[PDB]
Every structure is written in structure tokens, then in C-alpha cells.
Amino acid sequence: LGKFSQTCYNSAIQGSVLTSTCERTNGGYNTSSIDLNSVIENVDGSLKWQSPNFIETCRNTQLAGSSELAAECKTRAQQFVSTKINLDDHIANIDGTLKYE
Amino acid sequence: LGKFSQTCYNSAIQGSVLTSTCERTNGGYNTSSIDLNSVIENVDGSLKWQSPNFIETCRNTQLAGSSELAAECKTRAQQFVSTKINLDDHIANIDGTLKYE
Ligand SMILES: [Ca+2]
Ligand SMILES: [Ca+2]
Ligand SMILES: [Ca+2]
Ligand SMILES: [Ca+2]
Numbered sequence: 529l530g531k532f533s534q535t536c537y538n539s540a541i542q543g544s545v546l547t548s549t550c551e552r553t554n555g556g557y558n559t560s561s562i563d564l565n566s567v568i569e570n571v572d573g574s575l576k577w578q579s580p581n582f583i584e585t586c587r588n589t590q591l592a593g594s595s596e597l598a599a600e601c602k603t604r605a606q607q608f609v610s611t612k613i614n615l616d617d618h619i620a621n622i623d624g625t626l627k628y629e
Numbered sequence: 630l631g632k633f634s635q636t637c638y639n640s641a642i643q644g645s646v647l648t649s650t651c652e653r654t655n656g657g658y659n660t661s662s663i664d665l666n667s668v669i670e671n672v673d674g675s676l677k678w679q680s681p682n683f684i685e686t687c688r689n690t691q692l693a694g695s696s697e698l699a700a701e702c703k704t705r706a707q708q709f710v711s712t713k714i715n716l717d718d719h720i721a722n723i724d725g726t727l728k729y730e
Pocket of ligand 1: 640
């Protein structure tokens with residue numbers, strides 16, 4: 529995965545955004561940008577790649593009660609345990625549409 | 630923040646997606662969906678809200694060498710330490726455009 533640096537040049541980082549000029553398969557180059565803010569997290573001082581989608585390591589997702597998401601999720605030890613989270617924490621109803629905030 | 634459940638009904642969760650029918654400010658209801666996969670993470674078995682954008686708790690971001698993102702990031706103890714991450718880990722050059730994978 530990755531390896532962009534091997535076929536790109538003039539890379540730069542401003543804030544959360546990486547910009548670089550990269551080689552196209554069909555000759556020629558293209559300059560593009562990517563915002564790393566959401567795919568990179570700060571964990572107790574060290575930059576780590578954002579954790580994988582939870583559906584990759586959790587099963588049997590259900591709505592518990594009126595606003596809780598419940599599931600059986602894998603521990604680092606590879607064992608499934610019960611867990612839940614209140615979606616009312618961050619999911620809002622903004623004029624009829626569900627929005628994260 | 631949040632509190633969608635107080636003005637919505639017929640909520641349901643399928644996989645990573647929450648769907649609910651919510652009250653509009655201007656009378657009437659609207660049914661909408663939101664995918665929780667990326668805003669909820671599995672940390673050692675418990676569902677936690679995905680960590681905040683790293684630019685919120687990190688400063689002085691720079692490109693170190695050809696592919697590393699370097700910065701000074703806040704620890705849980707509120708002290709800034711040096712950290713870096715190799716963007717070649719997950720940032721690819723897909724036919725001239727930077728893409729995460
Ligand atoms: Ca509900
Ligand atoms: Ca549970
Ligand atoms: Ca580079
Ligand atoms: Ca550093």
C-alpha cells in the first residue's frame with residue numbers, strides 16, 4: 529500500500545494537507561492534494577493511522593433502545609466482547625437530516 | 630451536541646448505517662441515513678467516538694524528507710512531544726492523483 533513518494537515530486541505539507549506532483553500512467557504529470565486530517569489521529573502524542581472502520585472488527589450491530597449502537601467487537605486479543613455507544617452523543621437532527629457534529 | 634433521538638422516530642441500524650425519520654423545523658418529517666463506520670472506532674473491544682482531527686491537537690506540521698509527516702503533538706498530559714509518521718504507508722499515487730488506501 530501507498531508508496532506515492534516513488535513517482536511524485538515537489539511534495540509539501542501545509543496544515544493537514546499533502547500536495548504533490550505525480551506521474552500519470554499515460555505520460556505526463558498531475559498535481560493533486562489530499563487532506564490527512566481524518567485518516568491520521570493523535571494518540572497520546574504520536575501520530576497514528578486512523579483506526580479501521582468498526583464494521584471490520586465488530587458484528588451483530590443493533591440499535592439498543594432509542595439511541596444506542598450495540599455490537600460485539602473484537603479485542604486486541606482477538607476475543608469478542610459486548611459494547612455499546614450512545615449515538616445521541618454526536619448524531620444530531622439538523623432540520624430533518626441526520627448529521628454528525 | 631447530538632440528541633437526534635428526541636425529535637426522530639422509526640430509527641434502525643443495519644451494518645454501519647443509522648436511518649431515522651426526523652422532524653423538520655418547518656413542519657413535516659424527513660427520512661435520512663448516516664454511515665457511522667468512520668466516525669466510530671473499535672478500541673480494544675469498545676466502541677469509541679473516532680478521534681478528533683489531528684490538527685486540533687498538533688502544531689508545526691512539516692514534510693520531513695520525502696514522505697514523512699512530522700509535528701509536535703499534545704499528549705493526554707497536555708505536553709507537546711515530537712512525532713512523525715510515514716505517509717508512504719497509506720498514501721498512493723493512483724494515475725497521477727493522491728489517494729488513501
Ligand atoms: Ca430513535
Ligand atoms: Ca453490546
Ligand atoms: Ca515526495
Ligand atoms: Ca517530529
